[PDB]
């Protein structure tokens, strides 16, 4: 389990820095916002 997969096989994560995922799936986890229309 490397790089390709530090995201499902790593949940521990902190891998690099996160912070630039963070707020990325901030919008497709936090309640992810795209479910405006699929609600």
Do not use: A, C, T, Y
């Amino acid at each position: 389990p490397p790089s390709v997969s530090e995201i499902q096989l790593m949940h521990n994560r902190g891998k690099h820095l996160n912070s630039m995922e963070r707020v990325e799936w901030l919008r497709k986890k936090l309640q992810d916002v795209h479910n405006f229309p699929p609600d």
